[PDB]
């Protein structure tokens, strides 16, 4: 009931997070899948209403929604910001994440590593945005957040030195600026080493992005393999049924194939709809994460990484987005003795923004997230009431700065 623990050091750690944003856009045609360009099959299928119009409409909707997801995830900037030719960011090194002119498609190194890691009635529609353009969006976002902080997320980008920006972030996470300004080299070295560790780990993980591709490929393969099932008929080939029978009883062997293939197609469409809904939810989460961790600083716990979030970097992926969350992790704690308030001259004194700590003989005032003792004065404390109601009060003096200097 009278002991507290306060960290005396910290480590800068960067962690990754992968979120799928979109899936491959596919379209199917009944007249060539179910029928395979045969007039009699189309004539029989005309009796089944307009199921295929519904299927085509659903597939078109889920294809458009993919581009909508990509646009809402990546197109969150108006200008295309560029990093200055000279790169002096107070010792911080972003060479591994900035675009490289020599690399193909002007991708970054980590983007290149991520990209290297991973008919008959069926068509695949290319996405509206190519990989180069998504990479350009990511580069613009990276340059804007490097050279302007969060200002460009609310309007016109305002430049500011990077060290001062990270000082802003430290102030935001409850640590004073002097802690950062007196440890700039150590913080920069830790950040560089942590960035290098991510590169090393990736060069040696992308299961979530692999899963959607595998599921889509499996669904397409199952749909194709379903074409070789007789469904209790003579054969799975339309031409075998055509040129071996006249059409008063061959018409009975045809409709069975029609209903089987229709059932398979409807099942595929339903599964695609459910998968698209899940992908849309993931894309909404990714867009929210981008808007709240990249264009600003989030106070939500464990939303933009593990620890106290400082700032994040986005990176493009084949069909997703990869975030590099930079978090502040305290370490090397020593525990002391603590009192809720100090009684002096019959009055109780409370700390303005810190806590009272004692190393055994003396009492100090320090910030809660970093050990930095200070002499207790009347400038960092305020007075409220008398020292007989609060439980745990200890006796100590409060140094008034005015009295000695005046006399």
């Amino acid at each position: 009931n009278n002991s507290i623990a306060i960290p005396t050091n910290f480590t800068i750690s960067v962690t990754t997070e992968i979120l799928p944003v979109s899936m491959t856009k596919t379209s199917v045609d009944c007249t060539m899948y179910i029928c395979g360009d045969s007039t009699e099959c189309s004539n029989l299928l005309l009796q089944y209403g307009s199921f295929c119009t519904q299927l085509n409409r659903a597939l078109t909707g889920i294809a458009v929604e993919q581009d909508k997801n990509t646009q809402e995830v990546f197109a969150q900037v108006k200008q295309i910001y560029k990093t200055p030719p000279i790169k002096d960011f107070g010792g911080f090194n972003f060479s591994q994440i900035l675009p490289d002119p020599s690399k193909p498609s002007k991708r970054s190194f980590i983007e290149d590593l991520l990209f290297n890691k991973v008919f008959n009635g069926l068509t695949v529609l290319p996405p509206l945005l190519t990989d180069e353009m998504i990479a350009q969006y990511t580069s613009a976002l990276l340059a804007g957040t490097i050279t302007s902080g969060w200002t460009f997320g609310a309007g016109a980008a305002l430049q500011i030195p990077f060290a001062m920006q990270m000082a802003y972030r430290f102030n935001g996470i409850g640590v004073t600026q002097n802690v950062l300004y007196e440890n700039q080299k150590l913080i920069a070295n830790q950040f560089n080493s942590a960035i290098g560790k991510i590169q090393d780990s990736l060069s040696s993980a992308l299961g979530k992005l692999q899963d959607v591709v595998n599921q889509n490929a499996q669904a397409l393969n199952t749909l194709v393999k379903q074409l070789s099932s007789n469904f209790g008929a003579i054969s799975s080939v339309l031409n075998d049924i055509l040129s071996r029978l006249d059409p008063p009883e061959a018409e009975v062997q045809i409709d069975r194939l029609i209903t089987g293939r229709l059932q398979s197609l409807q099942t595929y469409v339903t599964q695609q709809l459910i998968r698209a809904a899940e992908i849309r939810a993931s894309a909404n989460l990714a867009a929210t994460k981008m808007s709240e961790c990249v264009l600003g600083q989030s106070k939500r716990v464990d939303f933009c990484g593990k620890g106290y979030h400082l700032m994040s970097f986005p990176q493009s992926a084949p069909h997703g987005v990869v975030f590099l969350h930079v978090t502040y992790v305290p370490a090397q704690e020593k525990n002391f003795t603590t009192a809720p308030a100090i009684c002096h001259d019959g009055k109780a004194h409370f700390p303005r923004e810190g806590v009272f700590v004692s190393n055994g003989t003396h009492w100090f005032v320090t910030q809660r997230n970093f050990y930095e003792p200070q002499i207790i004065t009347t400038d960092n404390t305020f007075v409220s009431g008398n020292c007989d109601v609060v439980i745990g009060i200890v006796n100590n003096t409060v140094y008034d700065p005015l009295q000695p200097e005046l006399d």
Binding site: Q79, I80, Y81, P84, T123, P126, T130
Partner: protein, 64 residues
Amino acid sequence: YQDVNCTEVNVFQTRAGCLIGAEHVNNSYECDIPIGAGICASYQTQSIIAYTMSLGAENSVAYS
């Protein structure tokens, strides 16, 4: 025409397929009608043009 070579059907060939009736230009505007693979179609003037969509206005932050 989707995923069809232009020889199998003024005339412009893109990644999305073969496009007939649009004039390819060297400019870069905002996307009006999305064609696919970074190509968009718009009606300037009286006529239809096909171009590459422009991501946005270029801006370099005076950083020091």
